[PDB]
From a paper:
[name] functions as a homo-dimeric enzyme that catalyzes the rate limiting step in the primary salvage pathway for NAD synthesis, the transfer of a phosphoribosyl residue from 5-phosphoribosyl-1-pyrophosphate (PRPP) to nicotinamide (NAM) to produce nicotinamide mononucleotide (NMN). Typical [name] inhibitors were found to occupy the portion of active site responsible for NAM binding and a tunnel-shaped cavity extending from the NAM binding site. Furthermore, we determine the crystal structures of six [name] mutants in the apo form and in complex with various inhibitors and present a definitive model to explain the differential effects of the mutations on various structural classes of [name] inhibitors.
The R191 side chain indeed occupied part of the volume inside the tunnel region, but did not completely block the tunnel passage, thus imposing a more stringent limit on the size of linker moieties in the inhibitor molecules. The bi-aryl sulfone group of series A compounds exceeded the available space, whereas the more flexible and narrower linker of APO866 can fit through the altered tunnel.
Author numbering:
A (entry chain A): 8 to 43, 53 to 487
B (entry chain B): 8 to 42, 53 to 486
The structure:
């Protein structure tokens, strides 16, 4: 079972002996720190951490003893605040005397603003605020996945509007293929759920149960898939029988959309000769509600997409839409699911535009690029102490390293406000108390072991909409 | 609770319908496919087998749950209820799968078979690749353990050159990655993988994983020491950094203590606060209880070099038997910012050029060690190589025209020692010809049971550097 006493960086076990004597309050905050592009971030994922790990009776006698035994060996010394943990057990029935205030989930906030704050509610527990730094900072991951996914949605929206004149099907155009390419089952669920803030297409099944348990949707499920081959289901037929595999699969899934990986041996042969000649009769007969989606999976991603489109354009009837861009017949589409990240997505859609192909033609799948190839320094997600009370006097505290101004932190008690022009500002030094800027946008979401405010997944999605969608 | 019926890529739910009719066997394998990182450490499959795959993993409730989810997720009924029910009824929900694998901790060149998977019941031909997704997650502990070992090789080379021995090597790269990984589960897995090569960690999650799944003769596989963070210095107020330092080193007067020194001005902290104001509290410390000064910002090489130059003028420096400068035994440095395999190399080489022994320094690495890694670094990949259809075995493979690097292996596979003592993978069942001795793979899972396993002590032994051996 999970033990919050064993869920911190080891060194934090020793910090209760390091703060100034007579310290009754430690107050800390989280930001995606500005760096001298990702100019705005989607705040998502804290509610998962609050419910799974921080709420309710999280301290027991057994958990205290267990931690004491492990730390004895791990440090080869007796440092461990057994008394401090016993106090929370006896006084609060093991509930954390902590208050957390946060911006609503789904909110889209510029870099360098306070996103949440943490402080102890009992003077004895001044050490507890930063004990939970480690677990709370892991919110960097769903924030960053949700943010990077939204930035990809912006690119897709721009090019789809330009080449087609609308945004139809935008939420279905970037699929999560990342389940195998993340570091753990838990990561898979968190990451998949963060992608679903922006899109509806996923093969990372783990995201669904996470959303149902911790957030919830009006709809039965937040994400959807369609039948699709993998190389095993083609190659099992034997090298000389690729056409047999294709024919069998499209006939098995004749009335729903079906994706067929087409590059096992020669993607260009498969498109021109197998799909384009031998099996053409099984393709042109398909419903608009049940297209074949041809899937290349190797080679230079842009060069391969353009060549596949070129081949299919010469084998199938192409129209020109009202913006002047070429469109495949409605029973045929393409999905590129190899080597797609934010950079290559941009290259591909711009390449398509230059060659006059509508973005209606194509969907994208992304795996490692979407869920694994991200770190905490992409958005500089960071947790810092900004205010303490010592001997009953508050002091505004901060770091400001001489050789790196980008690592300077904020001072004092913080609040988040709308500006007169409708943007965001973080007020420092308790200046929100002067009430010159309307209401603080941070709300209490956790207090003394209870989750005090929750958001549904539908609300989060609404908060995270693109401006272009709003327009 | 975990449900293996809901722990695969969505599209695999539809694959049972796509294989050739009358297929009784699907046989697949995992490799770190060949195209830096010429050899890989095999680690982490034992965790997956025990946590997720062994015993009764199918129940009536789990089947109904998956049926209900997939009905909405596909907007159609495509889920193989009958196939899963067969497993429940016939095998009391134990997976009729056999997995063979190289021993954990083994160091194997790229492009070799590391494990294989096949069904043991013809009805369950579709099951082999259902579990691809979970098994392929082994890329992560493999990659962490591998990249961590590559860093140990660098540290070994430079420590040996500047000091003449390897004393303390295993304590020189510390895992600081707990906050920087994507989940609690990842933290434990990744920390355990670093502990294959090193003994220093602040990612507490790794300890419990190892104890549960691998085991060590020692009470714990990894260790930490007291250390400050910016909040324990800055809480004292900007004019009282010296007061913070004095309090901390006095509280931890008889054990090693690390104290982050860059809150305001690292160079002032080293030269004036440690080097003058509090110098008397440093030179009095035991060899068993050094102060470790921790810079945490600026260019990593430049900052380390300047910190060492400052301390070298404030404290008595010696010259070791190799001609390199050495701080007194009560004083060391740790660089825990910006460290990855590339910057590690730059820092130790830069120290060597300035005649500073690698004894003087330890490193901590967080996102670089545990997060900034992907499955394409070692090209970890699972593919089908052999099937039986209508009673006839067929060697199968992919070989995409535009990427010969993606070509997969054909047929039944085995791993062998060559006459020169290296590894070779034989394809097409050629291992059966017996020209290359016994298969080095071992059966590790069969029909719901883990059949062979390794302690963490054995894994560490297998993963040793040549220089250590
Ligand atoms: O290729 C794979 C998965 C590969 C995979 C998975 C996991 C790991 N590694 C690889 N999945 C196929 C998904 C693409 C389906 C498209 C999306 C857009 N689209 C519609 O929105 C639609 C239009 C008209 C009618 C109905 C729907 C047409 C159907
Ligand atoms: O700075 C932090 C943690 C920072 C942190 C943690 C988590 C997240 N973010 C930042 N930890 C201090 C590590 C100090 C390691 C050295 C290794 C070599 N060494 C001995 O081998 C030794 C010498 C004499 C006696 C006993 C042992 C001296 C101690």
């Amino acid at each position: 079972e999970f033990n919050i006493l064993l869920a911190t960086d080891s060194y934090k076990v020793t910090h209760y002996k390091q703060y100034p004597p007579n310290t009754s309050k430690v107050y800390s905050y989280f930001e995606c720190r500005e760096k001298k592009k990702y100019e705005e971030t989607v705040f998502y994922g804290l509610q998962y951490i609050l419910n799974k790990y921080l709420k309710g009776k999280v301290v027991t006698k057994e958990k205290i003893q267990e931690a004491k035994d492990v730390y004895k060996e791990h440090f080869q010394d007796d440092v461990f605040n057994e008394k401090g943990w016993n106090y929370i057990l006896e006084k609060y029935d093991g509930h954390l005397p902590i208050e957390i205030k946060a911006v609503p989930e789904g909110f889209v906030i510029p870099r360098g603003n306070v996103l949440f704050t943490v402080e102890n509610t009992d003077p004895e527990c001044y050490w507890l605020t930063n004990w939970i730094e480690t677990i709370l900072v892991q919110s960097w991951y769903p924030i960053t996945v949700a943010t990077n996914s939204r930035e990809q949605k912006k690119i897709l929206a721009k090019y789809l509007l330009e080449t087609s004149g609308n945004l139809d099907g935008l939420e279905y155009k970037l699929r999560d293929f990342g389940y195998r390419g993340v570091s753990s089952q838990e990561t898979a669920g968190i990451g998949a759920s963060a992608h679903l803030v922006n899109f509806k297409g996923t093969d990372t099944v783990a995201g669904l149960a996470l959303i149902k348990k911790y957030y919830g949707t009006k709809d039965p499920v937040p994400g959807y898939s369609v039948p699709a081959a993998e190389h095993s289901t083609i190659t099992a037929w034997g090298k000389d029988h690729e056409k047999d595999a294709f024919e069998h699969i499209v006939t098995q899934f004749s009335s729903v959309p079906v994706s067929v990986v087409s590059d096992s041996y020669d993607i260009y042969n498969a498109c021109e000769k197998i799909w384009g000649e031998d099996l053409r009769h099984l393709i042109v007969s398909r419903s608009t509600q049940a297209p074949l989606i041809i899937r290349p999976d190797s080679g230079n991603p842009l060069d391969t997409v353009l060549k596949v489109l070129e081949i299919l354009g010469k084998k199938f009837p192409v129209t020109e839409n009202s913006k002047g861009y070429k469109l495949l017949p409605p029973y045929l589409r393409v999905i590129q699911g190899d080597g797609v990240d934010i950079n290559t997505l941009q290259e591909i859609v711009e390449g398509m535009k230059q060659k006059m192909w509508s973005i209606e033609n194509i969907a994208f799948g992304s795996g490692g690029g979407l869920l694994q190839k991200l770190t905490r320094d992409l958005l500089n997600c960071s947790f810092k102490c900004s205010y303490v009370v010592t001997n009953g006097l508050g002091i505004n505290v901060f770091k400001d390293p001489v050789a790196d101004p980008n690592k300077r932190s904020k001072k004092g008690r913080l609040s988040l406000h709308r500006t007169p022009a409708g943007n965001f500002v973080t007020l420092e030094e308790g200046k929100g108390d002067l009430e010159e800027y309307g209401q603080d946008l941070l709300h209490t979401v956790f207090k003394n072991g209870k989750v005090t405010k929750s958001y549904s997944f539908d609300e989060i999605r609404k908060n995270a909409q693109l401006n272009i969608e709003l327009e």
